[PDB]
Amino acid sequence: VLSEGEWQLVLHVWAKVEADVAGHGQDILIRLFKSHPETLEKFDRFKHLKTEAEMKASEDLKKHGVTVLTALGAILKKKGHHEAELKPLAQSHATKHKIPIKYLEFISEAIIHVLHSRHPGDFGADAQGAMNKALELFRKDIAAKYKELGYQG
C-alpha cells in the first residue's frame, strides 16, 4: 500500500494529466500501440490504424483515451479504496475483451514515458516511484479478480 505522502505525489502528477486529458490520452495509446503492436489487434475499433499519422488523426481514438483516463483518474483518487470501480472493469476485460494482465504492465510503462517526455525536469524520481506503486496496487488487485474467474493471464 501507499503512504499519504505517496498518494499526494500521485494526485499531484495527475493534475498535469487533467489539464489536457485528451492530449495525454492520445500520447499514451499511440506509445502503447506502436511499442507493442499485439495490443492494437485487441481493438476491432482501432485495428484499421497502421501509421502514427493515422492514429494521430483519429478523433475516435482520442474519445476513448478520455474515457479510459477518466475512469483511471477516478480510481486513483479513491486512494486504494477502489473495490467497486474495479469489479466491472475486471469482468469486462477478462471475459469480454480478453486482455492479458501483462498488457496492463505495458500500459503502465507507457504512462511513465509520456509523463517524462511531456514534462521534462518536472517529473521527479520520488513522484515516478509513487506512481509506480499506485499502478502496481491497481494491477495486483485486477489480477486477483482475473484469477477468481479463471483467467489471470
Ligand code: HEM
Ligand atoms: C489503465 C488501464 C485500463 C483502463 C482503466 C481501461 C478502461 C476501459 C473502459 C472504461 C472501457 C469502457 C467500457 C468497458 O469496460 O468495456 C474499456 C474498454 C476496452 N478496453 Fe480498456 N482499459 C484499460 C486497459 C486496457 C488494455 C491494456 C487493453 C488492451 C491492450 C484494453 C482494451 C479494451 C477494449 C478492447 C475495450 C473496448 C473498446 C471498444 O470497442 O469500444 N483496455 N476500457
